[PDB]
Each structure stands twice: as structure tokens, then as C-alpha cells.
């Protein structure tokens, strides 16, 4: 890799600089190089990895949606919209494949604490979901099954090893509920999961830790926002 000659500690340092400079493509490359050293990532480093690739893929998804909207509104012209949409789509799929490969090759494993294992499996579900947003046909069915299995496996760990207010548990349940509703066409599954997730968090809210109150309540509000949207 282009980062293979750089020390892990310098890669982490450069990822942090790239975040300060809002150079998220650089940040992701630096964090990919850190992952490929084969050492474990701390909570803080996992956040750097997550922030870098979410910004990269997030910008691609927004672009793909803009172009796809114009493409559909050219069906009520030449091939240029489809071509450029397909170009952005292909780039989006490449970044997701890169993330899924890092997860499969280096980060997902049986060892480690609950935060790490749930976080990586949630990420696997999330990046299969982003592939699902642009997939078609038999490819889309395969991708959706993969996201679901990843998400379910994360859920099984989070329910056994994490409290119902844990922000990583909550963010996973929120994203799994979005998967059910927006991707797998299972609105009832989505509504039920969000409701249970909110209720079990609300019943334990008094136990909240100062280091986690902000995250937990925000995810809870998003669950409620989605339920208002879906019901």
C-alpha cells in the first residue's frame, strides 16, 4: 500500500492532522494504512477510521442521490446523466469494498472487548447497506442478506455484553432499524426495533454516565424522529 513504509504512530498522527484540515480522503488513506499494520485499534482510533470513511462515502451518497434524482426526472436527453451517475456509483462501491475488506481482513475477530466487536460488525452492516442503496437485481438481494447477518450478529453481542444505554448499542439498533425500513422493506420490523430500543434505553436513563449522556440522548431522539416518520 502507499502507506506501507510509514510507521503506525505517524499514520495515526497524520489522520488527526487530516481531520483538522478536513482532508477526509487523506484521513481515510492514513487510517487504512494504520489498520493494515495488523494491530488493534483503540476506541479513539476506531472513531478516526469511522469519521474518515463516513465523510468520504457520505459525500458520494449525496452525489449519487442528486444524480439519480435528475436521472429519474429525465424519464417523465442523452446518456450523460446515467454515465456520470454510474461513474459516481462505481467509486462509491469501491470505497465500500475497501471498508468491507479492512473489516474482513484485519478488524473483525472473535477476540476483544464488546465495544470493538459490535462497532466493527455494525460497520460491516452499514457498508453493506450503502452498497444496497445503489445495487439492483440479484446483486441487491445478496447484499441485503449480508448487511442483515452482520447487523444481527452485532445485535446478539450488544444485547448480551452492553447496557441498553450504550451509544454503540443504540447507534447499531438505529442503523439496523433504518436498514429494515429503507432497504429490506420491513417497516414493522423497523418500527418494533426502534420502539424496543428506545423503551429499554429510557428505562435505564437514570444510570447514564457523564462521558455518554450526550450521545445516548441524541440517538434516542433520532429513534423517536424515525418513528414519527414511519407511523
Amino acid at each position: 500500500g502507499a502507506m506501507g513504509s510509514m510507521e503506525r504512530a505517524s499514520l495515526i498522527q497524520k489522520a488527526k492532522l487530516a481531520e483538522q484540515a478536513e482532508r477526509y480522503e487523506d484521513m481515510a488513506a492514513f487510517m487504512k494504512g494504520a489498520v493494515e499494520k495488523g494491530e488493534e485499534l483503540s476506541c479513539e482510533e476506531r472513531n478516526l477510521l469511522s469519521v474518515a470513511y463516513k465523510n468520504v462515502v457520505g459525500g458520494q451518497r449525496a452525489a449519487w442521490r442528486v444524480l439519480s434524482s435528475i436521472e429519474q426526472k429525465s424519464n417523465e436527453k442523452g446518456p450523460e446523466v446515467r454515465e456520470y451517475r454510474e461513474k459516481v456509483e462505481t467509486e462509491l462501491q469501491g470505497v465500500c469494498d475497501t471498508v468491507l475488506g479492512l473489516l474482513d481482513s484485519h478488524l473483525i475477530k472473535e477476540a476483544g472487548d464488546a465495544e470493538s466487536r459490535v462497532f466493527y460488525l455494525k460497520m460491516k452492516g452499514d457498508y453493506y447497506r450503502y452498497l444496497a442503496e445503489v445495487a439492483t437485481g440479484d446483486d441487491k438481494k445478496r447484499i441485503i442478506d449480508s448487511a442483515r447477518s452482520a447487523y444481527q450478529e452485532a445485535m446478539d453481542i450488544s444485547k448480551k455484553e452492553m447496557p441498553p444505554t450504550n451509544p454503540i448499542r443504540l447507534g447499531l439498533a438505529l442503523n439496523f432499524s433504518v436498514f429494515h425500513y429503507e432497504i429490506a422493506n420491513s417497516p414493522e420490523e423497523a418500527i418494533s426495533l426502534a420502539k424496543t430500543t428506545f423503551d429499554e434505553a429510557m428505562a435505564d436513563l437514570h444510570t447514564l454516565s457523564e462521558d455518554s449522556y450526550k450521545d445516548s440522548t441524541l440517538i434516542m431522539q433520532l429513534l423517536r424522529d424515525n418513528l414519527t416518520l414511519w407511523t
Binding site: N47, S50, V51, K54, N55, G58, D126, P167, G171, L174, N175, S177, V178, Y181, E182, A190, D215, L218, I219, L222, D225, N226, L229, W230
Partner: peptide
């Protein structure tokens, strides 16, 4: 509206 997923913390 699109459903909201977890944000960038």
C-alpha cells in the same frame, strides 16, 4: 423524508 441513521460523532 429519509430515515435518519447515526451521525458522525
Amino acid at each position: 423524508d429519509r430515515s435518519s441513521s447515526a451521525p458522525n460523532v
